[PDB]
Each structure stands twice: as C-alpha cells, then as structure tokens.
C-alpha cells in the first residue's frame, strides 16, 4: 500500500465528491445533447467550444479517474472491478480523443464508431445514483428470465421467416400484380359489357414500395428481410396495409393463405408470446424488487 | 396487460402472505 | 422383447445423445434459414449444397429414428406416442424428400406445402430442451381457458361483420365519395361565391385503396373480408385513417353512425376483450407455474 | 296456474330443449355469416333461401317463445324477466319479418336498423352455456367500477379537444403550408444561391387529407371531430405521421406547443390513464373470479 | 373571527351547496364544449351567447368563492390552502374575462392562453366528487415512483436520440436516395441487359417527406426533432414505414446498422421499459388502494 493512500481512497469514496462527479457526468452528457441540438452539422459553427469541452471534461474525468485509481492502487482488480473498467475504457476512449485533438489523425477512418462512445458515460450516473442503480440491477437480474421466452419467440418468427421467403419473396415481382373485382354482382357493371370490354373483372396494381423495391422483395426477399418484415408485424406496424393485405388480396381465391400466415403469427407472436415475455420480465422485476 | 396482471398478481400474493 | 433392445434403448435416452439430437436439429433448422437468406431465388446459385444437406440430415434423422424405435420394439404406442408420431411424420416426410432427389416426381405438384414442412423440425428441440418444454406446456394447458372469452371476442366480432358488410358494403361504389365543407362558415368563402360557382361546400374524393378496390368492396365487400378488416381493427392497424375516417367523413350529418361503430368496437373488443383474453391466458400460465 | 304448464314448464328448462335450443341459435348465427358471406349483394342471387330460411328460424323462435311462456303462464315478470323480454323482443322483432315477408310494406323504410337485429339473436347463446355466461356477468359486474377512471380519460380528452379546436382548427386552411429548412448551415446550399433565388429556406406543402378536407378542419375542426382525433390518438394510430407532425413542423420556430400537446397527452391519457381504466376493469374481474 | 362566519363556512361545507357547484362546474364545462361544437370559427356567429354565459357562469363563480373565503376569514391559508388557491386563479383570471368583456384590451394579445384557462375549471369537480378525488390523488402519490424509471427511459432515449443525430441527420440530403436490387440473381433481367443499359440494380427514391423535408432532416435533423422522433417509434407509431425502413435500405450493405438501431431501441425502451414504467405506476396504485 502507497503511503497517502488511505485518505485519498475514502476522499474519492466521499458523497460530495461522488456528488460532484455525478453533476459532472450530467453536465457532459448535456453538452453533447446541446451539441447535438445546436451543431449537428457537418460544418460546425462552433467547433472549438465543442473540441475544448470535450478536452476539458476528459480531463477532469482522467483526473479523478486517476484519485480513483489512487485508491485503488492502480489495482481496480479487487475493489468494484466493473465499474472500474468501464471507466476506464471511456476515458481511454477520452484520452484517445484528446490526442486526436491535440496531435494528428492516429486514429483510422474505419472507427469513428468509437468516437461515438462519449455518449455512454451518463451510464456512470447509475453508479451515483442509488435509485437508478436499483433498477438497472433488477432489469439486469430479470433478462436471463426473458431468455427462454425469447429463443421460443425467435424461433417462432424464423419458421414464419422462412416460409415467408418460400411463399412470398417473388409476390409483385413484375412491379404490379392482379387484384379481382365483383363489378357485376356488385351492380356495378353488366356481364355484357365486361365481355365486350368496356370495364373489367380485374385491375392491375403496382407492387412497388417506397423504398424501390417490389413487394416481395422489399419484404421477403431474403431471411433477414422478412424476420425484420416480422419483427415490424410482431410490433403492429403497417402490418397490413404495406404488407398483409397485398399479399391477401394478389390471391384471387387462396386468400386464406396469407390471412392465415399473418392472423396467425399476430395471434401467436404478438397476442400470447410478447405477453409471455413481458409478463416473465416483469414477475422477475417485482420479485427483485 | 401483461405489467397489468403482474400487479393484479402482486396483491393476489401479498393477500396469501397476509393468510399464511 | 429384442435381443439387445434395453441397451439400445436406454442409450437412446443418454443426455450426451439427446443433446447430440438437439445439436442436429438446430444445425438442420439453421441449415433452412441459410438457404432462404444465401439462396431464396427460384433458380438457386448452389442447388447442390442444399438437396445433399437435406439429404444427409434426412438420413441422420431416419437413422436415429430406427434408433429411437428399436429400443421401444418399433412399437412407439406405449412409450412417448404423440412425440413419436411427430418424429414418424417429419421422418417420413424426409423420406419423401430422398425419394423426389433419387427418383423422380412421385409427388405431385399440388403438394408441396408438405415440401414445406421441413421448418418445423425444430419443434423436436422442445422436446430435448426442458426449459422450452415447460413454457410450451404451459401455453397449451393454457389454450383451454382462453377458449370462452375468444369465442366471446368471435361472436362479437362476427356481429361487427354482419352490421359492417351491411352498412358499408357500397361505400364509395363509384370510385368516389363527397364530402362536405364549412367553408363559408370558416371564412374561406363567401356565399355569394358559394351561389356563383367560384368555391363549393363539397369535395369529391376518391374511394380506391391501395390494393385497386373501393373502400366498401375492399374492407367490408363481403363477410369474411369484414372479418378481416375488424381483426385488423383490433389491433389498431390504420383503422382510422384507412378504414374508419372515409366512412365517418362520407356521412354528412350522420357521422355518429361510424364513428359510434368503430369506437365501440375499439372499446368493447380491443379494450376490455384482449386485455381479458390475454389476462386469462396469463393467469393459467402463472398457475401453470 | 294453467292445468298442464308445470310440465311444459319443467320441459322447457330441459338440458336437451337447451341445447337444442342453442343449436339453433348458432345455427341461425352461421345463417345470417353465411348470407354475408355468400350473398352481401343488393340484388341477391338466392334471395328466397335466405327469406326462407329467416322465416324458419322465426317460426321455431316464436314456438319455443310460447313453449318458454306457457310454463310460466305468459307472464315472465317474475322467473327470469330480463333474458325474458330480451327473447320476447328479439321475436316480435322476427314475428314483424315474417309480416315483411308475407304482406307488405308495413314498415317505413327509416326503421331498417331494427332490421338488422338479427344478428343479436346469438346473445341467447349466452343464457345457454354457463361459461360465456359467467364472462359476460363478469364484465357487466365489472364496468360500474370502470365508470370513474373512464369519465376522467373522457374529461381529459374533453379538454384536449377544446384545446386542439382553439389551437389547430385553422391549420393549413388554405389548403398548403409552409415549413423552414436549414439547407445553408446544413451544406445542401449557400447564403448566396438563397439571397439570389435558385435555392429557398422554405417549402409549401400541401395540407389536404385523404379525405378532402385541410388538416385542421378535419383533425380539428369541430369539438367532435377533434374527440374522435384525440380517441385515434389514444389508440396510437397514425397519430404522428398524419396529425401531430404537421402541427409540429408547421410551427416554424413554436414548435414545443404542437409537440408538448401531443407528448403530454399521449404520456397522461394512453399511457396512465388506459392503462388505469384496465387495470381496474381486470381487477373488478378477477374478483369476480 | 367575523360575527356570522361560522354559519356561512358550514353552509358552504353543505352537500347540497357542493353538488349544487358541481352542477356549475359541469354545465360551465359543457356550456365550452358547446361552444367549441356549435361555434369554433373566429367569425363567431352566436358570439353575444358564449359571452354572456361566460359572464353568468364567472359571476357564479365569484359570488360562491366569496361565500367560500367568508367562511375561513377571507385567509384561505390555514384550511384546504391548494384547491382555494387554484379557485382563487381559475376566478381571478375569470374576472378578467369579465373586465375583457366589459371594459377594453386590457390584456395584451401575447396572453391568450391565460384565457384558454376556463377549460380547467373542471378540474374543481374532482373536488367535489370522492371517487374522482380518490383516483387523482392516487396517480399523484404514484407519479414520485414512477420518476426513476421514468428518467432512466429518458436518458436512454436520449442516448439514441445523440446517435440518430449523429447518423441519420443527412440521410437523403439530395432528395433521393438510392437503393439496390438483386434483379438478376431474381431472374427479373440478365447480367448482359444490365451490362448493356436496359435495366438497373439500383434505384432512385424520393427521400422527401409528407412535411416537406428530406428524411435525415426531419427525423433527426436536430437533438430534439430526434428525441420527439424516438417518442413517436417508442409510441410504434409508423416507425418502419416511416422512418426505420428508409435508413435500413439505404444502406446497401451495412443494413445491420439501422435494423439493429431501432430493433435494440423498440426492445430495450419500448418493451422493457415502457412496462417496467407502467408497472411501477399501476403497483403504487394498488397499494394506494
Ligand atoms: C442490461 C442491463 C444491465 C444489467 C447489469 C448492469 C450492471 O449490473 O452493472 C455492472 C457493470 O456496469 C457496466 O459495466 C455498464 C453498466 C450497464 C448499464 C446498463 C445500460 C442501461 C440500459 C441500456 C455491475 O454493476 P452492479 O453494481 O452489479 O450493477
Ligand atoms: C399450442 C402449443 C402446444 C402445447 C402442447 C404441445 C405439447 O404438449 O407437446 C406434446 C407433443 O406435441 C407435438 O408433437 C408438437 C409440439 C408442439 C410445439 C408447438 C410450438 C409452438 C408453440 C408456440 C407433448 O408434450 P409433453 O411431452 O407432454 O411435454
Ligand atoms: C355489457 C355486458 C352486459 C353484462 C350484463 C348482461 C347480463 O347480465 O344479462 C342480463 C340481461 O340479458 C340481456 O338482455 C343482454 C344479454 C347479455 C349479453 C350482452 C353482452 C354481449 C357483449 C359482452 C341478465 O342475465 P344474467 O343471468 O344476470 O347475466
Ligand atoms: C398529476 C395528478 C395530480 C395529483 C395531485 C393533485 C391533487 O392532489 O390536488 C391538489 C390540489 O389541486 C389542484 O390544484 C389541481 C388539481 C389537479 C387535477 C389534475 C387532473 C389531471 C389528472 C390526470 C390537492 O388536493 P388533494 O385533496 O390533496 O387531492
Ligand atoms: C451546463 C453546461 C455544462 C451544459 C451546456 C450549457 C452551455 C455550456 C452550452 C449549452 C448551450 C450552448 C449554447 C447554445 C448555442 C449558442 C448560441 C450561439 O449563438 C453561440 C453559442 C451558444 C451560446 C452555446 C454556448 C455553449 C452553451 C451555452
Ligand atoms: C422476440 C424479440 C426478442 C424479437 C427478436 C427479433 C430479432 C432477434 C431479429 C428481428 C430482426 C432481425 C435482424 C434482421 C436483419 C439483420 C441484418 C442482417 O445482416 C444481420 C442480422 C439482422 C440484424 C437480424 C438479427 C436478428 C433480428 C434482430
Ligand atoms: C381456427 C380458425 C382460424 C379456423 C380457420 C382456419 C381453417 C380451419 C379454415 C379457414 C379457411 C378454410 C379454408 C378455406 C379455403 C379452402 C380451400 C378449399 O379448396 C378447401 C377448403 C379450404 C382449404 C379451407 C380449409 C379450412 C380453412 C383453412
Ligand atoms: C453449422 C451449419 C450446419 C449451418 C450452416 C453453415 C454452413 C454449412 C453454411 C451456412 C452458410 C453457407 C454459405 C453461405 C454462402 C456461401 C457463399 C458462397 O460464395 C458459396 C457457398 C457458401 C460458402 C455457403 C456454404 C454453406 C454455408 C457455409
Ligand atoms: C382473437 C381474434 C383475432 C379471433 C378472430 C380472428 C379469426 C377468428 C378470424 C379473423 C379473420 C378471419 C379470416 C378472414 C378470411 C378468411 C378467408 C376465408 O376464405 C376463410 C376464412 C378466413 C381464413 C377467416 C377465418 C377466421 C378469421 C381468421
Ligand atoms: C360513447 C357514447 C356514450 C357516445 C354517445 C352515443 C349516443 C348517446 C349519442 C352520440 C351521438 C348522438 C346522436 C347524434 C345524432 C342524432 C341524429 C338526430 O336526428 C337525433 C339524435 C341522434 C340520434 C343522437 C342520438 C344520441 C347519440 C347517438
Ligand atoms: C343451418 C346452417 C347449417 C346454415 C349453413 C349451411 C347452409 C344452410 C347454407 C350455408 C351456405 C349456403 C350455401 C352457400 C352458397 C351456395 C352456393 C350457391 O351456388 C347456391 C346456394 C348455396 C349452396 C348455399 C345454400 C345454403 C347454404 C348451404
Ligand atoms: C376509453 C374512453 C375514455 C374513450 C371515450 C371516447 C368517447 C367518449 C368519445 C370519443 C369520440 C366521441 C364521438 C366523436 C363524434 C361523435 C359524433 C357526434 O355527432 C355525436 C357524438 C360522437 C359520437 C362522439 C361521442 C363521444 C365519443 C365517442
Ligand atoms: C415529459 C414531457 C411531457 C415534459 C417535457 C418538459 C419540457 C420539454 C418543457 C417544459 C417547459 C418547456 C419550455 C417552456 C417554454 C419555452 C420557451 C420557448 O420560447 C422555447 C421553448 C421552451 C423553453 C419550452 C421547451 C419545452 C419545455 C422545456
Ligand atoms: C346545460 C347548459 C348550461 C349547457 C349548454 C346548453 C345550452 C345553453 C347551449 C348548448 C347548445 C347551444 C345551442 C347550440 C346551437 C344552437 C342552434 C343555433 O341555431 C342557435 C343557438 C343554439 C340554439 C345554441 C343555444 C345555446 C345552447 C342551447
Ligand atoms: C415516457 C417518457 C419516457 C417519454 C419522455 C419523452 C419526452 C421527455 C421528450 C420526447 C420528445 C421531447 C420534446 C421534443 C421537442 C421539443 C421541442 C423543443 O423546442 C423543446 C423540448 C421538446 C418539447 C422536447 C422535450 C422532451 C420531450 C417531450
Ligand atoms: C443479439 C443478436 C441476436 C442480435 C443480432 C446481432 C448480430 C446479428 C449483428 C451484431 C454484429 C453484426 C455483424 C458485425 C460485423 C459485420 C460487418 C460486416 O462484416 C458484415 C455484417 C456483420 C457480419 C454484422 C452482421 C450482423 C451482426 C452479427
Ligand atoms: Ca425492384
Ligand atoms: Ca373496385
Ligand atoms: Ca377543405
Ligand atoms: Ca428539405
């Protein structure tokens, strides 16, 4: 043990210390939202006061990093090893991003993803704030429950991927498709005039999305495509105007098909399974509790 | 519906504490 | 009893081998969804890849079936029928797949929704898997008690139908509706210019969806598309802008109609309907618990 | 007392009549979703099977009606009174179709929505079977309870939309409006092509619905308009895309009232008020459990 | 204490005066519901009627808030200090509206949502009404616990909202975006008519939204048109069609990144949070029952 160190670790373990920690991390994180806000451009039109924050929060962060550290003997094996190395990651990223401002482009282009971690050190305020704490550690101790529910989930919707891409990753694939109408029951037209060719018994309709693509493609076109095509139905999202009811109605008289697939994986992947899981991670979460 | 039940069942089980 | 059938048999039941089997069956059922994200087109890039996959799993799978069946006498009655049946089923099936890659097109193209039936295989990893066992056990000892509040939930929406199909069933039959203007009122307009023919209080508005229809045809033309479209309705899918809004701003001065249809079915159905199936649902499962 | 009507009276209350009785009111039910189904036309194809076989049903209706009323000598006030007059309205209903059928037009044609009472025959199916009975009494023990949350949701939407009729009635009146860009700070232009006229900070987009109208005037322009607009909101249906993201960026520089708006009320409303209303209509529910 | 105070103050407290002020409160909020109906356009064309009602209604108002405050000494301050001072507000600025009305523009036209106030007279009901009391001072003892959870959601929306900033704030800059077909793979065209200029594996899409902006701009243009565009996907307000699905295709290969932006974002926040919130709400409300 280094002679002063003691004090220097029960000073850092200090809740005004812990405090002024706390309101530094905010007051970063509220600097990169309002750098985000009132600089989101390219062309910065303040690109020194955010360059220079940035350099002053990593100092300070590096600073009290390092009483930390005093603390804990430059150890951090021993005493709150994961909050510890997340710190020190981040201001590793930091101090990386220092010398990024001070001394030349060391860092490749190919990870700026990197340099978006700053955003992350708000995390740090769980460590603060009791309260936060609380519960970030019961949805930590509740997601291994989730699991099983979840693989059951994930299989589910990979079955309906696959048959999805089997059925309809070629639906529209000329750009239209054919719908059919009931003009002449339906008054609307006379049989005489639909043989002579003045109206019609079907229309064609265009299968291009928004996106480009036809319908199959853009939706079913590949696995990964229709398990997000399902994942977006699994949440009820434009799940039949855009996707089920093309695909309903481009069967003329099979249209049981796709009403069956979707209503279906709704009334299992959405009505019972996300109830299952949620119903699991909550129960997990209230027994935490 | 599925945080709705869980605290429906919340009272269920801390009425068979209050029992038991 | 077989000579050396108990050997067999309770060598089958090894956890190394059963894990082994769930091994097989995740690896097939990855095997699929790679086909599908690598090679969804109809003329495959690497056809050869995916029938000897196919063929070599379907043989490891009949193989290990004779395994399974030798140690029950190949009898499958007494011991684990409804698991037995389900492997028989799959397995024949596979047969049928080496069969239509040796030697030729015994099957009909008719049905090839059996060709498809290769994606739930993965069911089998229920049975290897305790965890998922216990969840899917609890969902389908479950499944009776939603039975009366979902027929419930059919019944009424069945009436939903039954009224919609008749009140909506020709709205916007021309392509178009009108609707109606305040303008006058709203200062847009004067009467003067109302009565001289410069503005109107009316808007003919267009009445076909996306799909090539007219809105009456296409959402409550007949039963079963009514059905349809309330089920949709239930779970909030564009039911207002889509479904509920033409037929509330059709009615001129009769937009209670419509309105006090849709909001009452949203509330009844949506609302207290679902929120009962599913806290039914729940309720056997946590007591399945 | 009548000489022979405690017999015909402990008869009627038989397990088989009962049931009888309840096949056919399914069977009446799966009549009236197959006449939709099959024939929703105007001009019916097989309009005489359907008069047919409606005057059946009302005929074996008004039979075990009088076989219902002879066991309690035609008075049904005092055994069983509601299920009673609901039965005896249903069939002076269907007593009235049959007179449709056979001797004119003795009903205005402004009271065919009694017409179409038909399809609430199937709520005796409910008497019939003791679990759908047990559910419906359930909710209707369990409303009362809702009532108080439910005014309070209706309070708040109520004040909502008196807000929103003061607020955004006027939006887009001229039928366009205009939103602001940040083309120059974002690089896409210069302050010399903008000060020069070959690029705009500003674009005119057009406010007309899919129905006709002007946002404001359709999403607000009536307290009962605006009512049904904050019920879609509620729902969560398209209430960005559509509603509250024009009013958001038509505000150039005010953009927090729009938004604050809709992010309250969505916060208070959907979120804590629905998800109070249900709790206690579940609660009220299982109690009655 | 005043010579016949005590009188009035138990007078006051009469049930029938408080249901007889109930009865105010609720025809004064119906009599601005009408209003808002009958009457929302600026060119009022029954203005005299909503003025003088207004008039009658704050008149009664003040009169029984005098009635009020000669019970307590004119003090308010020792007995029921909140709702007297939010009755001191709601009639001060209704007085207001009487000097408005009588005397000249006193208030300054930067002030009129002081005068949008009236619609929260209602609020006073929940006053006089024990169930809606009990209700709203449940949800206020149960908001302090919801804060934690509440701030946590928050922060994570607000990490992502820094992240959809810094990515997709220029998506679609141009107007258009490109995205990539498999056309021949699909069989749809040949590699030599690609080669040659007849068909494309790529395409040019309109980036441009219904507000008239490009995607990246109007979506995460800013920090705070980011974080309202997270509270819409948080909502699943069109959050594929809208906003996930044009970044997730404009990506030719790097997909995963927008797909794993929204699918982690719609997870974490939607799914777990959103129910641990709800959750937190609903327990300290039953343990407020
Ligand atoms: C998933 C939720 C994680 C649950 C466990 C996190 C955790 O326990 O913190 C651990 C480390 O802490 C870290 O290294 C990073 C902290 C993770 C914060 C979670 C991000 C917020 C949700 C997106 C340990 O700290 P604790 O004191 O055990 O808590
Ligand atoms: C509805 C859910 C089914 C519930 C009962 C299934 C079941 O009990 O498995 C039975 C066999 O059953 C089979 O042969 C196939 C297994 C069905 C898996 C369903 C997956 C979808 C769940 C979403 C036997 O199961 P056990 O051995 O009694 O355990
Ligand atoms: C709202 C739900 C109503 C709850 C009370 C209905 C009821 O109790 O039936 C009553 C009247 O019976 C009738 O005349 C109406 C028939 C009841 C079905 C209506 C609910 C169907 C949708 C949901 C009496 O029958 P009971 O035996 O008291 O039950
Ligand atoms: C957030 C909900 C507020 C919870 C506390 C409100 C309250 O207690 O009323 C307080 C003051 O009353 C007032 O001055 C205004 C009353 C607030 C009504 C809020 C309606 C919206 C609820 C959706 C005090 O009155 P009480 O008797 O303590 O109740
Ligand atoms: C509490 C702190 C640490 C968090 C952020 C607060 C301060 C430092 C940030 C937040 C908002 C920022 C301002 C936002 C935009 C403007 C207006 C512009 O014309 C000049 C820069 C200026 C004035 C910025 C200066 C720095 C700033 C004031
Ligand atoms: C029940 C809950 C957990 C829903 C789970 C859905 C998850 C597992 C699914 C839905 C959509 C899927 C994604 C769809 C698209 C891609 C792009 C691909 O290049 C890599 C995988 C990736 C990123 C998928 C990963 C798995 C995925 C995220
Ligand atoms: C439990 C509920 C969902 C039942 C509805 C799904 C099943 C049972 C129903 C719904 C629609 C029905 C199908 C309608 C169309 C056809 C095609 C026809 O050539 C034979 C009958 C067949 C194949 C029916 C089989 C049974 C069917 C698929
Ligand atoms: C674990 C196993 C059983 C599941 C699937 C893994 C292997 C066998 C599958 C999955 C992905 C497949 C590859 C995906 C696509 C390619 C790239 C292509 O240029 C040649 C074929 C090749 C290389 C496939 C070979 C077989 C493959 C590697
Ligand atoms: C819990 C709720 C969703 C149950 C009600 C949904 C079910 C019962 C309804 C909703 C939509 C309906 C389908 C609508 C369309 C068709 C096509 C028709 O040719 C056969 C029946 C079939 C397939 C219907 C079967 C029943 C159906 C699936
Ligand atoms: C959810 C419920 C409480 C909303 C209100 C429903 C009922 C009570 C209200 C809503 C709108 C009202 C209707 C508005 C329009 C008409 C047509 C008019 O010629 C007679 C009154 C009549 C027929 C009203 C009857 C009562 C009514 C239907
Ligand atoms: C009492 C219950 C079973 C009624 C439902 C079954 C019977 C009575 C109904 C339901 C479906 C109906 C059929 C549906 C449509 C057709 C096909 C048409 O070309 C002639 C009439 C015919 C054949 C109808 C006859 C009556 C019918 C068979
Ligand atoms: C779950 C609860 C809180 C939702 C309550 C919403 C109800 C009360 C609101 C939402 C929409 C409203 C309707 C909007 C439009 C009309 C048409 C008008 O001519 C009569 C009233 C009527 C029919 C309203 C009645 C009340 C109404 C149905
Ligand atoms: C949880 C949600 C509903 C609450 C959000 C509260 C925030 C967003 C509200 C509360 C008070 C509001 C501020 C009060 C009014 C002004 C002054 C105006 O000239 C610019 C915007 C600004 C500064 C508002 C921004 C949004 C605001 C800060
Ligand atoms: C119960 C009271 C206090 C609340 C509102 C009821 C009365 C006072 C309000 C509500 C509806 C209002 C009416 C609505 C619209 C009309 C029709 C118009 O041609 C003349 C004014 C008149 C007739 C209004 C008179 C005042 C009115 C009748
Ligand atoms: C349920 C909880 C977690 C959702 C919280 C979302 C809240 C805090 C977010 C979502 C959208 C945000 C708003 C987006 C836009 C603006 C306009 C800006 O000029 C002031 C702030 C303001 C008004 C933001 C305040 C905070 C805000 C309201
Ligand atoms: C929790 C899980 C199930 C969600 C999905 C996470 C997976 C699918 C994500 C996370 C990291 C992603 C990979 C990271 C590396 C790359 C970049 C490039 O070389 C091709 C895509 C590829 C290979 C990604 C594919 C999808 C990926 C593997
Ligand atoms: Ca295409
Ligand atoms: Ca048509
Ligand atoms: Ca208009
Ligand atoms: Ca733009």
Chains 1, 3, 4, 5 share one sequence.
Not at chain 1, 101 to 127: D, H, Q, T, Y
Not at chain 2, 3 to 11: D, G, L, M, Q, V
Request: glycine share 6%.
């Amino acid at each position: 043990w280094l002679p002063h160190q003691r004090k220097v670790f029960d000073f850092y373990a200090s809740q005004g210390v812990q405090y002024f920690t706390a309101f530094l991390i905010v007051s970063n994180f509220i600097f990169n939202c309002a750098e985000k806000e009132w600089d989101p451009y390219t062309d910065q039109l303040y690109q020194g006061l955010w360059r220079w924050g940035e350099f002053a929060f990593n100092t300070m962060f590096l600073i009290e990093l390092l009483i930390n550290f005093y603390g804990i003997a430059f150890c951090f094996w021993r005493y709150n090893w994961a909050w510890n190395t997340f710190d020190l990651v981040v201001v590793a990223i930091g101090t990386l991003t220092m010398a990024e401002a001070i001394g030349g482009n060391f860092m490749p282009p190919s990870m700026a993803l990197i340099r978006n971690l700053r955003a992350f050190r708000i995390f740090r305020l769980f460590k603060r704030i009791k309260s936060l704490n609380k519960i970030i550690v019961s949805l930590g101790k509740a997601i291994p429950g989730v699991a099983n529910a979840f693989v059951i989930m994930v299989i589910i919707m990979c079955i309906y991927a696959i048959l999805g891409v089997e059925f309809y990753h070629m639906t529209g694939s000329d750009g239209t498709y054919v719908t059919y109408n009931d003009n002449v029951k339906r008054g609307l037209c006379t049989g005489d005039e639909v043989e002579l060719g003045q109206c019609s018994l079907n229309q064609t309709v265009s299968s291009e999305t928004a996106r480009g693509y036809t319908y199959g493609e853009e939706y079913y076109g590949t696995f990964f495509r229709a398990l997000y095509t399902l994942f977006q139905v699994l949440t009820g999202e434009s799940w039949s105007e855009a996707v089920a009811r093309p695909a309903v109605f481009e069967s003329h008289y099979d249209s049981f098909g796709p009403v069956l697939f979707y209503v279906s994986f709704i009334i299992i992947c959405q009505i019972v399974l996300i109830n299952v899981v949620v119903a699991v991670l909550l129960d997990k979460m209230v027994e935490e509790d | 519906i599925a945080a709705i039940h869980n605290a429906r069942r919340k009272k269920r089980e801390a009425a068979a504490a209050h029992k038991a």
